[PDB]
Design a binder for this molecule. Structure first.
Ligand SMILES: COc1ccc(-c2ccc(Sc3ccccc3[C@H](CCC(=O)O)C(=O)O)cc2)cc1
Ligand SMILES: [Ca+2]
Ligand SMILES: [Ca+2]
Ligand SMILES: [Ca+2]
Ligand SMILES: [Zn+2]
Ligand SMILES: [Zn+2]
Length: 157
């Protein structure tokens, strides 16, 4: 499935204590911008009511039958487009979420997870943001790969 509308809302359910709130907000907002910059999708943050994409920070078992695993390993996960838990993006609180160095970069991970929230799978290109393995890349030069663009535009272009 894909989202069958182009105005998509998100809501931050709770904040990781790893980062200042402003920096969580900014990383998430910029991550959505990565995908709206190459599609007709528009994303809006809401602060009450039910959003399409709920952003959650949780550790271990957190009520969706896909428990996290402590620091390392699975860093986050997200559900594909749909009602309810569909679209929601969960970040493992046992990671150390960061803006610049150390830990696991929240912006880069959110770009990957929102990709899943929108319906993308994984890429075989190590340069793709949808590559299955996280690695820190220079955020100043960050750019979707041709494969990422092809994938998202096949769904929403
Ligand atoms: C800059 O380029 C980047 C490239 C990749 C990433 C990146 C990759 C992976 C995760 S999370 C993860 C880690 C290990 C196994 C499984 C998962 C879940 C699936 C979990 C499940 O299936 O239960 C998933 O792939 O979303 C987060 C971020 C980020 C940036
Ligand atoms: Ca983990
Ligand atoms: Ca949802
Ligand atoms: Ca943490
Ligand atoms: Zn979850
Ligand atoms: Zn993934």
């Amino acid at each position: 499935p894909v989202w069958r509308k182009h105005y998509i809302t998100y809501r931050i359910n709770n904040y990781t204590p790893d980062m200042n709130r402003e920096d969580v907000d900014y990383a998430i907002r910029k991550a959505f911008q990565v995908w709206s910059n190459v599609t007709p999708l528009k994303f809006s943050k809401i602060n009450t009511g039910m959003a399409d994409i709920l952003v959650v920070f949780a550790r271990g078992a957190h009520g969706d039958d896909h428990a996290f695993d402590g620091k390392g390993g699975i860093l986050a996960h997200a559900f594909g487009p749909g009602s309810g838990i569909g679209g929601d993006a969960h970040f493992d609180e046992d990671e150390f979420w960061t803006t610049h160095s150390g830990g696991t970069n929240l912006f880069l991970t959110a770009v990957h997870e929102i990709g899943h929230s929108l319906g993308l799978g994984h890429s075989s290109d190590p340069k793709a943001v949808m590559f299955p393995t996280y690695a820190y890349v220079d955020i100043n030069t960050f750019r979707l790969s041709a494969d990422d663009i092809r994938g998202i535009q096949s769904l929403y272009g």
